[PDB]
Design a protein around this ligand. Structure first.
Ligand SMILES: Nc1nc2c(ncn2[C@@H]2O[C@@H]3COP(=O)(O)O[C@H]3[C@H]2O)c(=O)[nH]1
Ligand SMILES: Nc1nc2c(ncn2[C@@H]2O[C@@H]3COP(=O)(O)O[C@H]3[C@H]2O)c(=O)[nH]1
Ligand SMILES: [Mg+2]
Ligand SMILES: [Mg+2]
Lengths: 372, 377
């Protein structure tokens, strides 16, 4: 909505209640204070400048008066429009705005903490405090280790064992995912080379050929272009085959719809296995799985820990397993802690499993012992 | 990540390139300008204050110098941490930041070379609402086996050529993540409930007593209006206003409501205890709340057109649809398959076990007057 004001009209005065702000589309306006009939100019605003935001942002009165220097045309921005856009902005951006506002007139402790935590995470990465552990994936019927998932671990000397609940999300929607993710993939692929070599050296030739290293890939690093180029470079570096490398993704990817179907279809043509991690939670979902080069899906612990108790959870799990089979997708059920859970999941048709029942995540050295 | 500076150290000078910002953890710093060797104090900052952000936000030089007044400890905030959060922010927020920055740094004329358009579109939408340009149409939901109209969905329409150059989805989206959803949504619900009263009265007056009792008016409820407190109070007020029963009113909700998890289960259980029917509008698209579907007062789920239009062509889409239908039955949830445009689609969906359907095959959305005629057939 657009409004035309004549030259010399006082649009509002210092000390008035704020109703709305205004974006100048044509002409010029003067911002002034008055102090005993002496008019003190602050500035002249022209096309594109917004004015009157300040009263709206923190329900104070007008900090200055505003007069049209010539005929002007103003677009009206409402209190609610400004408050809405501000309240939904990033909390560090909200902090930055509050500090600027208060200085110009002359959730903060949560926002400073987020900034600090990020810097603490990345310094710990560069101080070599992270390592990968490996959690066996087992064939449910014959109890054989068929692969492993690479899981990030923070062994901070000050705090002891730092929980992945904290730092994984910070890492994943931060630019540091790219350097951290490049390190993860290289390490996983390096340790895959070692697992295969050791398996062969102990005459388990077929196990080595069929072994799947499962690597968690975030959306950010997946949609970063040349992700596939670096992934390929790192595979050839360690002389590995695509068929032994499974890329675990959260369905939040498909979100990027056609684009996604893109790289995912890319990799699949190279022979990488693609897996939907935490299926049925998050945006890890049914609708896109219809048209996806998906070889695996993981049934989240949240379902598995309710199999025996809540029989409506047993229904949902059977549905997912039977659906996966109808699309020739195989299933890994994770969070398996009891033999009774593994029994039921095998009867329902899940081929693979992971969890404490079989083994917790362990360092490479202990994993190399488990496979023997 | 933490750095200790001695009393009197110039941390940086006015005119330098910005590397990082700092949070003061201990002590005090002076912000000053220099103007012919006269040092002009702007302020003293203490514990918790941030400084040096401004150069980072828009790659300008330092607007002032900063000296430690005593021994200080600074936490480092990186250029990268500021620039990412700033560059990804809303364009109105970006405008606000630029204006504040320039004003704090500051007779010449200040200028700024979308944004204004987003603001205007919203005001155009809301003025059209208040100028009575919106109305509800109703699309029959039919029992697939016996072809009988069992209910209808209320669908919002804008009667203007302007609806037009926005896109049909887009005007609904503007409404739904804007505060205007509350006044627009209150009008929608009242109108739908008013027109439900009329459908039932006419059904009774023609001795179709069982049809009137079983008739479901389906109303799309956005997340914003659902999580707004006193949503249930207004909904109840409007039901009693039109002397209606909860059992005839179905609340269609996006699956994205389950991003609240525990809070969402309670809010739905509140409506369900009152006797409202709850339906998941877009099942299997958008947010996956299947872990939660285990414990949800859900009576209906709708299979989206995006699945239905791929049944015959892409047989992996046929697989997913059968799975959803069979799963819904295992939880005593009934299914409405929407976007049904051909008899062959309705055939397949009935064989798979879907009870209800909507789409062009049966009828497009129509005004109340035409809907009242369709009922009598
Ligand atoms: N306080 C202040 N406001 C300014 C300045 N330059 C432009 N303005 C605008 O003038 C407006 C006066 O009313 P508000 O306080 O609502 O919002 C103010 C700003 O939008 C300045 O240097 N100081
Ligand atoms: N320009 C300006 N900067 C201030 C003021 N008060 C505190 N500061 C801080 O001083 C810093 C000087 O360098 P920057 O411009 O990078 O960031 C500035 C702000 O963080 C003030 O009144 N004006
Ligand atoms: Mg996983
Ligand atoms: Mg709908």
């Amino acid at each position: 909505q657009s409004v035309d004001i004549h030259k010399d009209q006082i649009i509002f005065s210092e000390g008035d209640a704020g109703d709305c702000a205004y974006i100048i589309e044509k002409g010029r306006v003067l911002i002034y204070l008055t102090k005993d009939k002496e008019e003190i100019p602050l500035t002249i605003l022209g096309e594109g400048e917004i004015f009157g935001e300040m009263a709206l942002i923190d329900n104070q009165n007008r900090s200055a008066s505003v007069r049209a220097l010539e005929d002007v045309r103003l677009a009206i921005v409402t209190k609610q429009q400004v408050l809405e856009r501000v309240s939904t902005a990033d909390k560090v951006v909200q902090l930055l705005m509050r500090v600027l506002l208060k200085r110009l007139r002359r959730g903060t402790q949560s926002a400073l903490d987020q900034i600090k935590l990020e810097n603490q995470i990345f310094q710990a990465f560069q101080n070599k405090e992270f390592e990968l552990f490996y959690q066996p994936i087992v064939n449910l019927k014959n109890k054989t280790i068929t692969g492993c998932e690479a899981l990030l671990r923070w062994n901070s000397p000050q705090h002891g064992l730092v929980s992945p609940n904290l730092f994984i999300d910070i890492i994943e929607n931060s630019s540091m995912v790219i350097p951290i993710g490049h390190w993860i993939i290289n390490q996983a692929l390096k340790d895959l080379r070692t697992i295969q070599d050791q398996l062969r050296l102990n005459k388990k030739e077929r196990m080595a050929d069929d072994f799947m290293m499962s690597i968690n890939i975030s959306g950010r690093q997946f949609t970063h272009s040349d992700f596939v180029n670096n992934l390929e470079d790192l595979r050839e570096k360690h002389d590995l085959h695509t068929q032994n490398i499974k890329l675990e993704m959260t369905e939040r990817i498909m979100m990027d719809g056609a684009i996604a179907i893109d790289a995912l279809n890319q990799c699949r043509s190279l022979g990488y296995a693609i897996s939907i991690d935490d299926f049925g939670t998050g945006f890890s979902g049914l609708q896109y799985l219809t048209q996806m080069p998906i070889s695996f899906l993981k049934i989240d612990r949240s379902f598995v820990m309710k199999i025996l108790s809540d029989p409506k959870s047993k229904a949902v799990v059977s549905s997912i397993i039977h659906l996966a089979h109808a699309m020739d997708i195989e299933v890994i059920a994770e969070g398996i802690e009891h033999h009774e859970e593994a029994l039921v999941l095998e009867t329902l048709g899940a081929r693979f499993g992971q969890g404490y029942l079989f083994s917790k995540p362990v360092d490479l050295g202990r994993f190399l012992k488990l496979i023997k």
